[PDB]
Amino acid sequence: QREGINASARYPKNWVTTGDPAREFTMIQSAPLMLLADPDEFVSVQLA
Amino acid sequence: QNLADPAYRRRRIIMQNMRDEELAIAQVEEMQAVSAVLKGKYTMTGEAF
Amino acid sequence: MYTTAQLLAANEQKFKFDPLFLRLFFRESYPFTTEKVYLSQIPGLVNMALYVSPIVSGEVIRSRGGSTSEFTPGYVKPKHEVNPQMTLRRLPDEDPQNLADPAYRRRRIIMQNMRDEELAIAQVEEMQAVSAVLKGKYTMTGEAFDPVEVDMGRSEENNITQSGGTEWSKRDKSTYDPTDDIEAYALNASGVVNIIVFDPKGWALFRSFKAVKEKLDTRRGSNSELETAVKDLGKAVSYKGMYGDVAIVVYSGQYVENGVKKNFLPDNTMVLGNTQARGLRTYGCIQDADAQREGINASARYPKNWVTTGDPAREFTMIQSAPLMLLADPDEFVSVQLA
Numbered sequence: 405q406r407e408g409i410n411a412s413a414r415y416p417k418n419w420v421t422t423g424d425p426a427r428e429f430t431m432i433q434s435a436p437l438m439l440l441a442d443p444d445e446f447v448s449v450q451l452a
Numbered sequence: 453q454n455l456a457d458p459a460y461r462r463r464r465i466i467m468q469n470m471r472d473e474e475l476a477i478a479q480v481e482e483m484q485a486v487s488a489v490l491k492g493k494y495t496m497t498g499e500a501f
Numbered sequence: 502m503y504t505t506a507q508l509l510a511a512n513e514q515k516f517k518f519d520p521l522f523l524r525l526f527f528r529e530s531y532p533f534t535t536e537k538v539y540l541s542q543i544p545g546l547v548n549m550a551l552y553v554s555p556i557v558s559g560e561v562i563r564s565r566g567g568s569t570s571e572f573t574p575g576y577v578k579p580k581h582e583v584n585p586q587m588t589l590r591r592l593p594d595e596d597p598q599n600l601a602d603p604a605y606r607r608r609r610i611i612m613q614n615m616r617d618e619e620l621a622i623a624q625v626e627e628m629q630a631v632s633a634v635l636k637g638k639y640t641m642t643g644e645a646f647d648p649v650e651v652d653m654g655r656s657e658e659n660n661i662t663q664s665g666g667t668e669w670s671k672r673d674k675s676t677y678d679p680t681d682d683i684e685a686y687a688l689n690a691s692g693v694v695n696i697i698v699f700d701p702k703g704w705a706l707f708r709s710f711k712a713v714k715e716k717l718d719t720r721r722g723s724n725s726e727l728e729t730a731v732k733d734l735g736k737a738v739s740y741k742g743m744y745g746d747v748a749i750v751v752y753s754g755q756y757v758e759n760g761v762k763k764n765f766l767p768d769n770t771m772v773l774g775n776t777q778a779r780g781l782r783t784y785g786c787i788q789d790a791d792a793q794r795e796g797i798n799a800s801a802r803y804p805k806n807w808v809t810t811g812d813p814a815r816e817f818t819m820i821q822s823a824p825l826m827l828l829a830d831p832d833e834f835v836s837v838q839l840a
Contacts, residue, residue: 414477416470418466420790420791420794422807422809424578424580426789426790426791427790428790430466430469430470430473432473432474432477434477436480436481436484438481438484438485438488439484439488440485440488440489443492446489446492448489448490448491448492455534455535457534457786457796457798457799458786458793458798459793459796459798460796462790462793
């Protein structure tokens, strides 16, 4: 939100945490909403 | 015969890990498409969600 | 109220510290890029060709060497607090006739913090040096730090003990000469030795023998010994004088533990040492992500200043390094346990 990228495909983010043990994370976050328009456009024939 | 510093090893680990996360995203992304045009229904359910 | 009482600077309160080891023996220092850092010691032995004339051609030469060992880690981690809420009050420094802001006072206390951290660095590194030239074996252990054992390669002839049935105690304080034992112990010294460092009390019963009396034993007796003692001032190193071909050294250096003092030497011990005994100040790599970011993993020391977010704004001071004090040849000293 601080960079105004509230909408995006993906979201990389690298960041190091302080403290007596030091260590850094690389992060990916996104909100996949994979959808298709018309369900009846395909017929799922379960073969046998 | 030719080593490096753990720093560039850390760079290698970072690049590899980025590659793995990108691959995991690309792979999990097809799950919803598979459900959608495999049944016309889909289940977005899993732990921490 | 109105006081106007000029009070100048206060005490300093430095107890004692004289390394004499990390200032005389370990003059070599090498950072690490790998955990497995190697050091070889060739056991060379070549004879002659006594009778061979250029008609009786015989044996050919043979190569020598092939002994090496490694010891990885080294470490230290002295972090301390910044105390942001106590920067308002004045220190024992910052005279009441001239005060200043707590922000620059924060800078001064940060200088104090880093200085005290380096004090701890010295006090711990000197214990490693004590292990090194005290046994030929070194054990770096503690809490949040697994034990690390380094058998430097010291031979048991270098771990002589006076213990027996005559050691020094029940000899003659007036006529007995301890020189014979001195040469006996210097025999298996793997080279010429010229420094015989004593304990603060180990030299007490040593000089109890009157065979020490006739020795030079002058405050102006040597050349390297005097300058070494001078640059090692602190009234913890006492170069007594010359013992003929060797010099009398009495080392009484100390370090603070958590809160208590301790002498770097035991009560009754002595070392057969050479002035050119070469040692290592070799350093490891920093096990911190921040250091790797600029690739400063390989370094002697590693300062760091940082601050945490949130409602309590807390700054901190940090030093990381991996001290791995070592020696080229442990056999050059002989740790005689005096008794």
